[PDB]
Ligand binder design. Structure first.
Ligand SMILES: CCCCCCCCCCCCO[C@@H]1O[C@H](CO)[C@@H](O[C@H]2O[C@H](CO)[C@@H](O)[C@H](O)[C@H]2O)[C@H](O)[C@H]1O
Ligand SMILES: CCCCCCCCCCCCO[C@@H]1O[C@H](CO)[C@@H](O[C@H]2O[C@H](CO)[C@@H](O)[C@H](O)[C@H]2O)[C@H](O)[C@H]1O
Ligand SMILES: CCCCCCCCCCCCO[C@@H]1O[C@H](CO)[C@@H](O[C@H]2O[C@H](CO)[C@@H](O)[C@H](O)[C@H]2O)[C@H](O)[C@H]1O
Ligand SMILES: OC[C@H]1O[C@H](O[C@H]2[C@H](O)[C@@H](O)[C@H](OCCCCCCC3CCCCC3)O[C@@H]2CO)[C@H](O)[C@@H](O)[C@@H]1O
Ligand SMILES: OC[C@H]1O[C@@H](OCCCCCCC2CCCCC2)[C@H](O)[C@@H](O)[C@@H]1O
Ligand SMILES: [Ca+2]
Ligand SMILES: [Ca+2]
Ligand SMILES: [Cl-]
Ligand SMILES: [Cl-]
Ligand SMILES: [Cl-]
Ligand SMILES: [Cl-]
Lengths: 240, 354, 174, 341, 240
C-alpha cells in the first residue's frame, strides 16, 4: 500500500536527464508528478512504470525492490499503467478485452473470471458497448474500457500518463471523477501531465521536478507558493 | 490452451501472412506466365493451357514461399500490435514477453501442419499434373513414360513403354565385379506380380562365357528379383524437391538398397522435414526483431529487414546444402543447418529482452 | 489502381527481357552444328573380336590404331593382326600388315608388308607373304593381285595373282 | 545556395554508405565464384565491372533513401511551407548526378576496358559438359552417358549406351573405368580401360572391343567487352556498336534515373523512409533488363545497329518527364475534375 | 489581404470528418479555430494549410483560389505555416536557416539578404544564436528561430498549429507576446489549439467546430456564452 521511489537517476548520451527524484504514493492517495516540460518528470514516471531502466535509485512497493524487474512482473506486483496513446485491443470486443486480462490470472476459475467481467462492465457503465470492437469506440468510452481492462489485473497502483492531454473541458470533470473513483477504490494513483491546473485540482499531493531534480513537494496549495516553482515553472501570476 | 490473447495475436499474424502469401504467389505467377509465353503455340498449348499450368503450379510456390511468408507475416502483424501500443499494454497488464513468444509459437503450429500437408499431398501431385498437362498439350500426344532408363546395382535397364504396372520392351544389361558385361535380357512385355518381383513373358536371355561362347535362350517366362518397384520407376524423372515426403523416404530406401548414393534424396527428404522448423525459426526471428532493433520503426523498415533476412536465409540454405555432402556430413545436418543459425540469431537478440 | 497497373506492366517487360536473355544464351549454347566428314570413332591398342550369327568367335583383329567412320562404314586399322579361328577354338591362321580397311560388307584389305602364318604345324603350308590382300572374313575367300610368295616346310614357290579361301584351304592362281 | 549544398551533403554521405555495402557484397560473391572455379588480382580486375553496374544503383538508392528520410522527418514539408520547391531538390540531384556520371564515364570508357585488357593479357598467359548420377544425353542425342563420380577427373566408371544406328554404325554399349571429356569445333569424349559391345539384345553376333583408350563424338566473332573505346567508335560492326552503345547508355542513364527517382521519393510520415523500395527496384530492373536484351538483339543482328538502345533510354526519359509533371497545376486540376465530377 | 475558407468538407475511409466549415482571417487579426478534440477543427486547419487535400469547399486569399495549389504554391501566395513539432534544420546554423529561406526571393540582392537577416536576428533576439546549429537549441529559442525563418518568406498569414502545446505557464505569456507581435507586424494569425483558455485569451475572433461543422462564431465572450458550445465543448461551469 506504499509505492516508494528513492533517488532515481537516468542519463542519455553521456548527459544526465534525471539527477535526483523521490516520490511516494499510498493506497487511497492521488499524487501528481509535475514540473517544467522535459525537466525530468516524464523519465521519472517511466522509471517507476518500467519502460526505462533506471541508472540509480530504488523502486519499492511495500519494501520490495522492483528496480531490476521487467514490466510484466511489476504488474504482477500491483502496478497498473495506462498509456497516453490508445492502447485498447482494436479487433477485440470490450468483453474480450477484459476477459483477455482476467485470463492471465491462473488462480481464477472460469466462473470467477466471468463474475469479474460482469462486475467490471457494470461498474464503469460499459455494459451496452460490451459487444463493440475496441476500434469502434469514442475517446471517453475507450478510456473507460482501458481502465476496466487495467483493473482486471487487480492492481494496487494506477499510473496514468497524461490523462488530461487534448481533453475537452466538458470531459475534464468526468476524468477527475474517474480518478477519484480509482482513489476511493483503494488504488494509489500517480498522474503525470502538463496541465497543471486540472492536475492540482484532482490530486491531493504533488511533486515538482525541475532542472533534473525535485524542487518542491506537498499539497497543491504548498507547491503553488514555492518560490523556485514560480521562478522556473508557473510564473508570478498563475491562475488555478 | 485457448487464450483470448493467444488467438488474438494468432488471427492477426495469419491474416497478415495470408495477404503476404497471396502477394508473393501473384508476383511469381505472372512471372511464370511470361515464361510460358516464351513457348506458347506448341501443339495445343494456347494461352488457356499456359494459364492452366501457372494455376496448377501454385501449391508448389506456396510450399517454397511459406517460410519467408511467415517471417514477413509475423513481422508486420507483430509490428502492427506494437505500433498501436497493444503489446506494451499486454505487458503492462501481466502478459510477459515469454507469453507473447508462446502465442507466436502456438500459431506457428497450424502453419507447420499446412506446409507438411502441402509437401506430402498437394504440391507434388499438383506439380506432376502441371508438368504432364504441359507436355501433352505441347506435343499433341507425345511425352506417360516413353524411353525410361534405370540402374539396379550393377544392372542397367531400359524400358520402351511403361504402364500402370506393366513394362513393354524391356532391355537389361548385367556387369560383373570386373566391370564387364555378363548377361543381357530382353522381353516383349513384363508384368508386376508381387512385392519386389516381376515376370517377363517370352524373354530372351544371353550369357557370355570365356570370350568364345555366347548362349541365348528363349524362355517362355523369366522371374526378376529386383528391389525396383514401379512406383520408384515413375518417379526417377521428377525433381527430388517436387517428390512427396513418403515418396522421398521410399526412394532413399530404394537407393540405399541398390548400392547407390542416396545423399541428394536424403538431403531433399530432410529439407522437406525441416521446412516447418524453418518457418518457426522465421517467426521467432520476427519476434526478436519486434522486441529488439525494429521495436519503434515504421512498417516499411520491418518489411525491408524481413526481405533481407529471408533472402539471406535462402542463400544460406542453397550454400549449406551442397557443402554438407561434399565435405561428408549427414544430409540431416545440411538440411537443418540454416534453421539452427537463424535460431541462434533469434535467441541472441532475445537474450536480453526475454 | 493506375500505379499498380503500371507496376504490373513493368513486371511484364522485366520478365520478358530476362527470359529473352536466357533464350538468347540458350540458342548460343543450343548451336548444335553437324560435324564434318572425319573419323567418328578412334582408339589405340585395340582388340576387336567378331562373332558369327550363331555365337561362335569368328575372328580377332588386334591393331595399334582403329578409326570407325559413319558415312561409309569403313573401319581403318593401323598395323592390324587378324587371327582366323576354325570353330572359334582353333586359331588356324594369323594375318598381319601395317594398314587395313574393314568395310560395311565385312571385307578386309591389307597393304604394307602383309604376313600370313598357318598355326597348323603339320599341314605343309607354313607362311605366306604379299603386298596387298583382300579377304572376306564371312566367306574367308581372299584375293591378291600383286606378287605372292609361298613357303612350305619342304617346298617354296613364287608367283602372282592368287585367289583362294581359308575356309577349306582352297588356293587357286595362275 | 545554402540549402542545395545541404541536400548534396546529406545525400552524398548516404550514397557512399550504400556503395560501401554494395561493393562489399559483390566483393564477396565474386571472390567466392572465383575460388570455386591470383584470386586477389582477378578480383581487383573485376572491380570495374562491379562499378559499372553499381554506380547507377548507388546514387539511385542514395537519393531515394536520403529524400525519403527528409520527407519522413518533414524537412521537405517545411521547405515547401516556406517557399522551397522542386527546383532546388532537382538542382541538387542534377549536381550529384553530374558527379556520379563523370565517375561512371571514366569507369566505363577507360578503367573497365583497360582492366579487362589487362585481365585478357593475364588470361592469355597463365591458365563441365556432362554431369554424374543419372542418365545424361549428349548434344547429338544418339548416345546416353552415365557417369558415377567426377572428382577432379579421377574415378569415373563410365557407361555409354547407343540404342540407335547412326549412318552405317551398329548400336553399341560400352563400359570403361575412367574417361575424359573435352571441347576445336566439336565436343569429344575418351574412355580408358574398358570394353565395347556392338550388337542387339535379341541377336547374338556381337563385336567386342577391349580398349585401353577409345574416343567418341559428343557434339559440335570476337571479344567486344575489352577494347579501346576510340578505336571502337569507328569499328563498323553490329555487336561492336552494341557494346559502344551499352557503354554510352550507362553514362547517359545516370541522370535519367536521377530525374525519375526525385519525384518518386515522396512519402508521408506514416509511410516509411523505405516505402518506395519495391517500385524503385522494379523500375531499375526493368530498365536494365530491357537495355541488356536490346543489346543482345543488336549483337544478333536481330535489330539494326542504328536505332540501338536509344528507344529504351527514350522511354526512361519520357517516364521521368511524366512523373515530374505529375505535381504541376494542370495535372492537379485534372485530378480535381475527376474528384468533383 | 483576407484569407477565407468556405463550406469545407473532407472524408477519410468513407467517414465524414469535416462536413461544413467556414472561417476567415484578415490581415491584422488573431483568429482561434477551436472545438472538441478531432471534431473537425484540426482537419479544417490542415486543409487551409495545404497538408490535406480538400474534398469540397473553396479557399481564397484576396479572391484568388488557392485550393488545389500544393504547399509551395500557396506559400508563394502569401501563406506561412508553423507546425507543432520541431521544424528547424538541425544540421544548419540559425544564420543559415534564415539565409536559406531568404535565398529563394530572387527580387532581393545579396546586400538586401544580409540586411534582412540582420534585422530578423536582432528582432527576435537571436543574434547570439546566430552561428549555432539548430540541433543544439532549447524550446523557446528554437521557436523564435523558426518563426523568424517563417517571416523570411514575407507571408501575409501565419497558421500556427497548437502553439500552446505542453508549455510551461511561465512561457505561456512569452508565446502570447510573440503571437501578438506577429499580429502587430501586419499579419493575420490563425490559431488551432486545445488550450481553450489560452487561445480565447489571445484570439480576437473564435470559430468553434463540433461534429464536423461550424456551430458557433464570434468574439471570445460570444462563444463562452453560446449554449451549444457550453453543452458539447466547455461545460456550464467553465472558467476563462
Ligand atoms: C515486395 C513486398 C513484399 C511484402 C508484401 C507487401 C505487404 C503485404 C501487405 C502488408 C501490408 C498490409 O498491412 C496491414 O496493416 C494493417 C494496418 O496497420 C494491419 O492491421 C492491424 O491493425 C492494428 C494495428 O495497426 C492491429 O491491432 C490489427 O490487429 C491489425 O490487423 C493489417 O494486419 C495489415 O494487413
Ligand atoms: C532488396 C529488396 C527489394 C524489394 C524490396 C521490397 O521493398 C518493400 O516494398 C514494399 C512495396 O512497395 C513497401 O511496402 C509499402 O507498400 C505497402 C503496400 O502498399 C504498404 O502496405 C507498406 O506499409 C509500405 O511500406 C516496403 O516498405 C518495402 O520495404
Ligand atoms: C523500358 C522502360 C523502363 C523505364 C520504366 C519507367 C517506369 C516509370 C514508372 C512510373 C511510376 C508512377 O507510379 C506512381 O504513380 C503514383 C500514382 O499515380 C504517383 O503518385 C502521384 O500521385 C499521388 C496521388 O495520386 C500523389 O499522392 C503523389 O505524391 C504523386 O507522386 C507516383 O509518384 C508514381 O511513382
Ligand atoms: O520517431 C520520429 C523521430 O525520427 C527521427 O529519429 C530517427 C533516427 O534518425 C533514425 O536513425 C532511427 O531509425 C530510422 C529507421 C532505421 C534505420 C535502419 C533500419 C534497418 C531496418 C531494415 C533493414 C535495413 C534498415 O529512427 C528514428 C525514428 O524512430 C528524428 O531524429 C526525431 O526528431 C523524430 O522524433
Ligand atoms: O535522424 C537524423 C540522423 O539521421 C541519420 O540517418 C541515418 C540513416 C541510416 C539508415 C541505414 C538504412 C540502410 C542503408 C543501406 C540500405 C538498407 C537500409 C543521418 O545520417 C544523420 O546525419 C542524422 O543525425
Ligand atoms: Ca458467479
Ligand atoms: Ca491546458
Ligand atoms: Cl522528462
Ligand atoms: Cl464511475
Ligand atoms: Cl496549466
Ligand atoms: Cl479534427
Amino acid at each position: 500500500a506504499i509505492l516508494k521511489a528513492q533517488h532515481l537517476a537516468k542519463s542519455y548520451k553521456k548527459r544526465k536527464v534525471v539527477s535526483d527524484v523521490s516520490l511516494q504514493v499510498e493506497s487511497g492517495q492521488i499524487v501528481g508528478l509535475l514540473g517544467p516540460n522535459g525537466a525530468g518528470k516524464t523519465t521519472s514516471f517511466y522509471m517507476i512504470v518500467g519502460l526505462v531502466a533506471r541508472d540509480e535509485g530504488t523502486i519499492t512497493i511495500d519494501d520490495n525492490d522492483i528496480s531490476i524487474l521487467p514490466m510484466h512482473s511489476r504488474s504482477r506486483m500491483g502496478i497498473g499503467y495506462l498509456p497516453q496513446e490508445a492502447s485498447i485491443f482494436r479487433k477485440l470486443s470490450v468483453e474480450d478485452n477484459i476477459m483477455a486480462v482476467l485470463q492471465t490470472r491462473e488462480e481464477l476459475t472460469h466462473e470467477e473470471r466471468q463474475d469479474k467481467l460482469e462486475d467490471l462492465l457494470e461498474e464503469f457503465h460499459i455494459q451496452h458497448i460490451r459487444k463493440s470492437a475496441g476500434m469502434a469506440l469514442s475517446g471517453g468510452e475507450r478510456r473507460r474500457v482501458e481502465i476496466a481492462r487495467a483493473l482486471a489485473a487487480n492492481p494496487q497502483f494506477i499510473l496514468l500518463d497524461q490523462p488530461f492531454a487534448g481533453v475537452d473541458p466538458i470531459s475534464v470533470i468526468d476524468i477527475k471523477k474517474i480518478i477519484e473513483h480509482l482513489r476511493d477504490r483503494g488504488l494509489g494513483v500517480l498522474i503525470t501531465d502538463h496541465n497543471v491546473r486540472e492536475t492540482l485540482d484532482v490530486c491531493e499531493k504533488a511533486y515538482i521536478v525541475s532542472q533534473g531534480r525535485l524542487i518542491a513537494e506537498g499539497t497543491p496549495q504548498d507547491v503553488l507558493n514555492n518560490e523556485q516553482v514560480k521562478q522556473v515553472y508557473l510564473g508570478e501570476q498563475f491562475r488555478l | 490452451m485457448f487464450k483470448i490473447l493467444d488467438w488474438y495475436i494468432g488471427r492477426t499474424i495469419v491474416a497478415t501472412t495470408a495477404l503476404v502469401l497471396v502477394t508473393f504467389v501473384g508476383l511469381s505467377g505472372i512471372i511464370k506466365y511470361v515464361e510460358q509465353l516464351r513457348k506458347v503455340g506448341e501443339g495445343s498449348y494456347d494461352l488457356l493451357q499456359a494459364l492452366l499450368f501457372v494455376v496448377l503450379s501454385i501449391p508448389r510456390d506456396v510450399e517454397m514461399f511459406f517460410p519467408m511468408a511467415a517471417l514477413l507475416g509475423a513481422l508486420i502483424g507483430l509490428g502492427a500490435l506494437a505500433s498501436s501500443s497493444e503489446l506494451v499494454v499486454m505487458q503492462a497488464a501481466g502478459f510477459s514477453k515469454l507469453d507473447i513468444g508462446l502465442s507466436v509459437l502456438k500459431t506457428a503450429i497450424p502453419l507447420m501442419i499446412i506446409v507438411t500437408l502441402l509437401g506430402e499431398w498437394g504440391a507434388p501431385q499438383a506439380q506432376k499434373m502441371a508438368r504432364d498437362m504441359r507436355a501433352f498439350a505441347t506435343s499433341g500426344g507425345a511425352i506417360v513414360r516413353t524411353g525410361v532408363w534405370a540402374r539396379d546395382a550393377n544392372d542397367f535397364i531400359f524400358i520402351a513403354k511403361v504402364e500402370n504396372e506393366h513394362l513393354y520392351g524391356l532391355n537389361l544389361w548385367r556387369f560383373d565385379e570386373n566391370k564387364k558385361l555378363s548377361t543381357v535380357i530382353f522381353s516383349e512385355q513384363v508384368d508386376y506380380v508381387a512385392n519386389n518381383e516381376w515376370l517377363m513373358k517370352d524373354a530372351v536371355l544371353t550369357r557370355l562365357v570365356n570370350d568364345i561362347e555366347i548362349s541365348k535362350e528363349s524362355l517362355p517366362e523369366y522371374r526378376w528379383r529386383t528391389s525396383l518397384a514401379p512406383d520408384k520407376l515413375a518417379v526417377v524423372t521428377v525433381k527430388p524437391e517436387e517428390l512427396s515426403l513418403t515418396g522421398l523416404s521410399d526412394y532413399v530406401h530404394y537407393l540405399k538398397a541398390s548400392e547407390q548414393d542416396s545423399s541428394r534424396y536424403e538431403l531433399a527428404l530432410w529439407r522437406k522435414v525441416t521446412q516447418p522448423i524453418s518457418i518457426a525459426v522465421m517467426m521467432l526471428m520476427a519476434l526478436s526483431f519486434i522486441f529488439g532493433p525494429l521495436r519503434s520503426v515504421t512498417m516499411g523498415a520491418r518489411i525491408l529487414s524481413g526481405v533481407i533476412a529471408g533472402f539471406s536465409f535462402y542463400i544460406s540454405s542453397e550454400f549449406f546444402g551442397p557443402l554438407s555432402l561434399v565435405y561428408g556430413l549427414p544430409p540431416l545436418f545440411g538440411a537443418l543447418a540454416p534453421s539452427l543459425v537463424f535460431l541462434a540469431i533469434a535467441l541472441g537478440l532475445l537474450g536480453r529482452k526475454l | 489502381s493506375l500505379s499498380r497497373i503500371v507496376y504490373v506492366l513493368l513486371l511484364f517487360i522485366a520478365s520478358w527481357s530476362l527470359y529473352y536473355l536466357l533464350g538468347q544464351e540458350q540458342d548460343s549454347k543450343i548451336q548444335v552444328a553437324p560435324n564434318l566428314e572425319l573419323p567418328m570413332f578412334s582408339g589405340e591398342n585395340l582388340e576387336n573380336i567378331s562373332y558369327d550369327e550363331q555365337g561362335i568367335r569368328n575372328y580377332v583383329i588386334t591393331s595399334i590404331h582403329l578409326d570407325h567412320y559413319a558415312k561409309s562404314g569403313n573401319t581403318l586399322f593401323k598395323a592390324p593382326i587378324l587371327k582366323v579361328y576354325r570353330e572359334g577354338t582353333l586359331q588356324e591362321w594369323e594375318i598381319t600388315a601395317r594398314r587395313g580397311i574393314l568395310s560395311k560388307d565385312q571385307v578386309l584389305t591389307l597393304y604394307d608388308d602383309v604376313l600370313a602364318k598357318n598355326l597348323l604345324p603339320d599341314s605343309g603350308f607354313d607362311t605366306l607373304t604379299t603386298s596387298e590382300m583382300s579377304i572376306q572374313l564371312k566367306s574367308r575367300d581372299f584375293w591378291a593381285d600383286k606378287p605372292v610368295e609361298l613357303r612350305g616346310p619342304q617346298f617354296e614357290t613364287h608367283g602372282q595373282a592368287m585367289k583362294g579361301n581359308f575356309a577349306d584351304h582352297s588356293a587357286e592362281l595362275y | 545556395m545554402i540549402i542545395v549544398r545541404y541536400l548534396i551533403r546529406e545525400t552524398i554521405k548516404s550514397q557512399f554508405a550504400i556503395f560501401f555495402v554494395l561493393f562489399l557484397v559483390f566483393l564477396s560473391q565474386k571472390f567466392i565464384r572465383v575460388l570455386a572455379d591470383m584470386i586477389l588480382s582477378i578480383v581487383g580486375l573485376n572491380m570495374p565491372a562491379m562499378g559499372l553496374l553499381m554506380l547507377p544503383l548507388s546514387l539511385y538508392i542514395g537519393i531515394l533513401l536520403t529524400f525519403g528520410r527528409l520527407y519522413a522527418e518533414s524537412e521537405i514539408t517545411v521547405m515547401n511551407a516556406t517557399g522551397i520547391g522542386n527546383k532546388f531538390l532537382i538542382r541538387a540531384a542534377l549536381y550529384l548526378a553530374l558527379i556520379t556520371a563523370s565517375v561512371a564515364a571514366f569507369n566505363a570508357l577507360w578503367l573497365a576496358p583497360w582492366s579487362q585488357d589487362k585481365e585478357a593479357h593475364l588470361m592469355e598467359q597463365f591458365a563441365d559438359l556432362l554431369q554424374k548420377g543419372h542418365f545424361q544425353r549428349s548434344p547429338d542425342g544418339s548416345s546416353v552417358v552415365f557417369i558415377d563420380n567426377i572428382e577432379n577427373r579421377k574415378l569415373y566408371n563410365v557407361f555409354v549406351a547407343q540404342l540407335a544406328p547412326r549412318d552405317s554404325i551398329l548400336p553399341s554399349v560400352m563400359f570403361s573405368h575412367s574417361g575424359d571429356v573435352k571441347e576445336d569445333g566439336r565436343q569429344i569424349i575418351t574412355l580408358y580401360d574398358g570394353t565395347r559391345y556392338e550388337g542387339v539384345p535379341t541377336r547374338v553376333d556381337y563385336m567386342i572391343t577391349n580398349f585401353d583408350s577409345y574416343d567418341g563424338l559428343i557434339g559440335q566473332e570476337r571479344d567486344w567487352e575489352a577494347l579501346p573505346t576510340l578505336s571502337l567508335l569507328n569499328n563498323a560492326d553490329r555487336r561492336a556498336q552494341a557494346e559502344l552503345q551499352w557503354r554510352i547508355s550507362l553514362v547517359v542513364c545516370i541522370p535519367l534515373l536521377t530525374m525519375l527517382v526525385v519525384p518518386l521519393s515522396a512519402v508521408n510520415p506514416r509511410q516509411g523512409r523505405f516505402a518506395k523500395m519495391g517500385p524503385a527496384i522494379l523500375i531499375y530492373l526493368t530498365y536494365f533488363l530491357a537495355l541488356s536484351a536490346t543489346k543482345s538483339a543488336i549483337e544478333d543482328g536481330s535489330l539494326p545497329v542504328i536505332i540501338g538502345l536509344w528507344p529504351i533510354n527514350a522511354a526512361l526519359l519520357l517516364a521521368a518527364l511524366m512523373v515530374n509533371t505529375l505535381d504541376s497545376i494542370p495535372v492537379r486540376r485534372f485530378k480535381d475534375r475527376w474528384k468533383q465530377r
